[PDB]
């Protein structure tokens, strides 16, 4: 994707006016610096490869991290899947209105020893299970449940010390593109909820320890990384100025356009 | 002369005398839905002379201390003729628009407007926990107007109408990425836009989704000497283009 | 039992790799594509659209619409300065927040020419001539019209067409420049001066305004993607 190169120019005295235009037509001027001054003929070998939509988005970014404690009440995690809880992936996906991609989903699982009381703990390696419940399925309510059979829900098992687990998910949607913005309601009476919380129905993600609690409590943590592949993007949009406030909606507190300087002529 | 145009749609005609060029969409013209993209099976209703004509909204006054206005676009024409009556008896529908803003003055007045048409403009509430209600987001062909101050958090359910953030949290200067046009009272007199149907689904319900928002923001304010005419109005006319509907049921 | 031998770099998670991975939903049928208007293929198409730049940062104008208007009046002396700012499109707070400066803050290197458009939002009976200059670094800031006419300038006559494009050229020793503020790769200054006055008739307001635009040419390019310093987070959004 090589960029355009400059051509040679000569002094002119004519009625052809490249500089004078009209910005009121909503049209950006296509002038080049060989039209207003004398340039020499260079040839550009610069490319526009690293500015593409594939190279700008296909990078892993953390979206959540949740902690579950082994051998204590409520030793399992859950997460209603969305991409609007972090600052740096929300600002990248919200430069476009409609997106259509695949995924490449990598988890990073750690552990830490809790302050036990008995002497001489000696634990084996730990095994974790990450079950994905689609919208409508039966959900677990404790650690030793029937819902972790995974006869139809997909799930991964992982033993500590190895490479991190990684799957790949196609374009799972009802429409023809994901929608980052939605100006509408849920009900037809135009009460109730408003915004992008209406369209988000993607499931739930549960995590637990497979191993039973031997002698000491253990608190683990799993971080979740998204990576869009095969991206198509439509209708660009100006980037967000203010800071984000909530998850479900686009509420904000106003801010100035830029930081200020002392004068209009100061450098 | 490239300064005159003439638009004709149905039994209505718009002539203009000094104007800029016309801006068409993202490069595409409004057409009908094709057969390899449709998802409903029953036959659509295309009346196409009764609903594709110029509907004129109400007029707003451009004051000196005026901040802006906005209209939600498939909602302002919900009580306009046979376009508002087809929207009630049907469940689905798709539409492209043509928009003609017109604001005339003399050679002794000065000012500037930005006429921009933004898709999926979600507005943010003043209180940082709730969402704005329906009456504050849009009125039936009446302009809801911005402010130059900040609406405080004690207002329970209102819209944040600080004009330099354009209600959506972005910088108002960067709004020239959407298809837009300026009205400079030095040279221009009217701004014309053509918008196709932009949505992630081929047909959508028109009563719980406003897929377009028209914003008019004065960047350089209106100014005149003493003696010139102080009342300067702005008038917006919208005409649907290539509309069709599915799913006929009772009135609602 | 084919004998293999594993190299360093095994079982690592490098966040910019290009591998294959087993699918979680086999034989899944995606919804077919649609012809949606306005498909963007490259981020250098967003940076080619002009956006209004807030030149008038004066400590009480940033939270208003008066940051975008450059004040222009009818003087009594000659050769005054209208505005002036250095040319740093990713570090100087004038060009920092515009649509060009928000794409440059995801990348580290940049190279190419930069357009600058000026619309005269005055009356229809007002005239005037301006001098739009650009000076490469090495000297100071030009302090006179005599010192700024020795650079790359253009004289703009207002009239029927109310716009003029000053295209700064690519004058640098290196092929690329740094987005951050650097003394080694400075880029110069952009100034504006009255050529003649603004002459207005009777019953016309003498205080006009000027808007300024900024975009990129067709030789613009960026490199070495990084993370933007403008967004921030302390706790999770809920």
């Amino acid at each position: 994707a090589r960029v355009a190169d400059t051509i040679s120019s000569r002094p002119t005295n004519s009625e052809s006016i490249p500089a004078l235009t009209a910005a009121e037509t909503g049209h950006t001027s296509q002038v080049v610096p060989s039209d207003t001054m004398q340039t020499r003929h260079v040839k550009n070998y610069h490319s526009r490869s690293e500015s593409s939509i594939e190279n700008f988005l296909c990078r892993s970014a953390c979206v959540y991290y949740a902690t579950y404690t082994n051998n204590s009440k409520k030793g399992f995690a859950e997460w209603v899947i969305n991409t609007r809880q972090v600052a740096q992936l929300r600002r990248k996906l919200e430069l476009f209105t409609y997106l259509r991609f695949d995924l490449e989903l990598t988890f990073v699982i750690t552990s830490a020893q809790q302050p036990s009381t008995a002497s001489s703990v000696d634990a084996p390696v730990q095994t974790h299970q990450i079950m994905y419940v689609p919208p409508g399925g039966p959900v677990p309510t404790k650690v030793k449940d029937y819902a972790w059979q995974t006869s139809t829900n997909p799930s991964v098992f992982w033993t500590e010390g190895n490479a991190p687990p990684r799957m790949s998910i196609p374009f799972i949607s009802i429409g023809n593109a994901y929608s980052c913005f939605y100006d509408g309601w849920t009900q037809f009476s135009r009460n109730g909820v408003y915004g992008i919380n209406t369209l988000n129905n993607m499931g739930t993600l549960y995590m637990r320890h497979v191993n039973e609690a031997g002698q000491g409590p253990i608190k683990s943590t799993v971080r979740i990384y998204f990576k869009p592949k095969h991206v198509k993007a439509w209708v660009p949009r100006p980037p967000r100025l203010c800071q984000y406030e909530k998850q479900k909606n686009v509420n904000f507190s106003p801010i100035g356009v830029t930081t200020s300087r002392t004068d209009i002529i100061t450098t | 002369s490239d300064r005159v145009r003439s638009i004709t749609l149905g039994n209505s005609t718009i002539t203009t005398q000094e104007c800029a060029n016309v801006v068409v969409g993202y490069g595409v013209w409004p057409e009908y839905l094709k057969d390899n993209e449709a998802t409903a099976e029953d036959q659509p209703t295309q009346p196409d002379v009764a609903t594709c004509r110029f509907y004129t909204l109400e007029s707003v006054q451009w004051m000196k201390n005026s901040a802006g206005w906005w209209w939600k676009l498939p909602d302002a024409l919900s009580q306009m003729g046979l376009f508002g009556q087809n929207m009630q008896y049907h469940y689905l529908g798709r539409t492209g628009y043509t928009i003609h803003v017109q604001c005339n003055a003399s050679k002794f007045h000065q000012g500037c407007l930005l006429v921009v048409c933004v898709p999926e403009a979600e507005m943010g509430c003043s209180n940082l926990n709730n969402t704005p209600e329906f009456s504050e987001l849009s009125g039936g062909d009446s302009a809801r107007m911005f402010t130059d101050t900040q609406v405080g958090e004690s207002n329970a359910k209102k819209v944040q109408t600080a004009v330099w953030n354009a209600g959506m949290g972005v910088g108002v200067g960067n709004l020239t990425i959407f298809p837009h046009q300026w009205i400079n009272l030095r040279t221009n007199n009217s701004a014309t836009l053509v918008m196709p149907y932009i949505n992630s689904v081929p047909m959508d319900n028109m009563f719980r989704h406003n897929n377009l928002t028209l914003m008019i923001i004065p960047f350089v304010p209106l100014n005149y000497s003493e003696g010139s005419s102080p009342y300067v109005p702005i008038t917006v006319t919208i005409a649907p283009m290539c509309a069709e509907y599915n799913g006929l049921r009772l009135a609602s | 039992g084919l004998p293999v031998m594993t190299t360093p770099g095994s079982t690592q998670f490098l966040t910019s790799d290009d591998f294959q991975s087993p699918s979680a939903m086999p034989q899944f049928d995606v919804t077919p594509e649609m012809q949606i208007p306005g498909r963007v293929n490259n981020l250098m198409e967003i940076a080619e659209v002009d956006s209004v730049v807030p030149v008038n940062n004066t400590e009480d104008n940033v939270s208003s619409l008066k940051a975008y208007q450059i004040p222009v009046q009818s003087n009594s002396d000659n050769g005054k300065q209208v505005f002036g700012f250095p040319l740093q499109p990713g570090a100087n707070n004038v060009l920092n927040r515009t649509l060009l400066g928000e794409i440059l803050n995801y990348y580290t290197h940049w190279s190419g020419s930069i357009k600058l458009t000026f619309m005269f939002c005055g009356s229809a009976m007002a005239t005037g001539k301006f001098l739009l200059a650009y000076s490469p670094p090495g000297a100071g800031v030009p302090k006179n019209r005599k010192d700024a006419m020795l650079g790359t300038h253009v004289i703009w006559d207002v009239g029927l067409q109310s716009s003029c494009v000053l295209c700064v050229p690519w004058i640098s020793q290196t092929h690329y420049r740094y987005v951050v503020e650097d003394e080694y790769t400075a880029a110069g200054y952009v100034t504006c001066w009255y050529q003649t006055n603004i002459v207005v008739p009777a019953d016309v307001q003498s205080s006009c305004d000027i808007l300024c635009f900024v975009s990129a040419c067709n030789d613009f390019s960026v490199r070495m993607l990084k993370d933007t310093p403008f967004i921030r987070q302390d706790t999770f959004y809920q």
């Epitope: 507190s253 106003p254 100035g256 | 958090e153 | 940033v62 939270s63 706790t235 959004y237």
Partner: antibody, heavy 117, light 106 residues
Framework: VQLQQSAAELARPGASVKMSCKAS????????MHWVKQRPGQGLEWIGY????????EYNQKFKDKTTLTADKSSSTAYMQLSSLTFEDSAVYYC???????????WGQGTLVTVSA | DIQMTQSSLSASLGDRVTISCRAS??????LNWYQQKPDGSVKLLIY???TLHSGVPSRFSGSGSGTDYSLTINSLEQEDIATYFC?????????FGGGTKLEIRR
Amino acid sequence: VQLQQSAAELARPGASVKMSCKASGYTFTTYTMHWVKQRPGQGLEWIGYINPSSRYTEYNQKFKDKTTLTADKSSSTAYMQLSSLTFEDSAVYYCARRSEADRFVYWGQGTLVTVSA
Amino acid sequence: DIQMTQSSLSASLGDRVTISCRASQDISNYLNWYQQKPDGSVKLLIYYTSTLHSGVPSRFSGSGSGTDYSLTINSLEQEDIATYFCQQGNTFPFTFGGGTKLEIRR
């Protein structure tokens, strides 16, 4: 990043005291700065905030006519002035920087204000 | 205006401590717990019903839904003798709860 308050002050009943909360470690014109008051025999009580970018202040409905908040973008400082002082304004005043939705992640160390003769 | 009801709870070293505060109406899981040291330094502990702030030890945990909420310390140490408030974020203006100070048993 840390907020550093002024020292403890002392004034007559009916007088006026002006406090300070000098911020550092972050861009001052981004986040709003709130003020919380704690009487020594009760809990904490909200007063109001100020957007430093636009100088918009919004007070609590009980403190609307006594307090007044102000800021300056150069020296990275937020002030608060009390007026028509009674004996019920003897407390400790904290300045807090509001996080994402309703959270106060950073606090000042508090200034003690007392009135007597 | 939501009244946030919270007075002096006593516990010994190394046991399970539970602090509770009750809202006036439904606040929908918008609660924050703060800790005020006896020299006067306040810091955020739990910025949701249960989510811990980054830099808080694992002894603290929160629970509850609707109207009644709770805060639990499972192993009370010496540095946890302070004052704990709860704060709603559902309605303007923000209201804090009354304090609850800890003290050793015997």
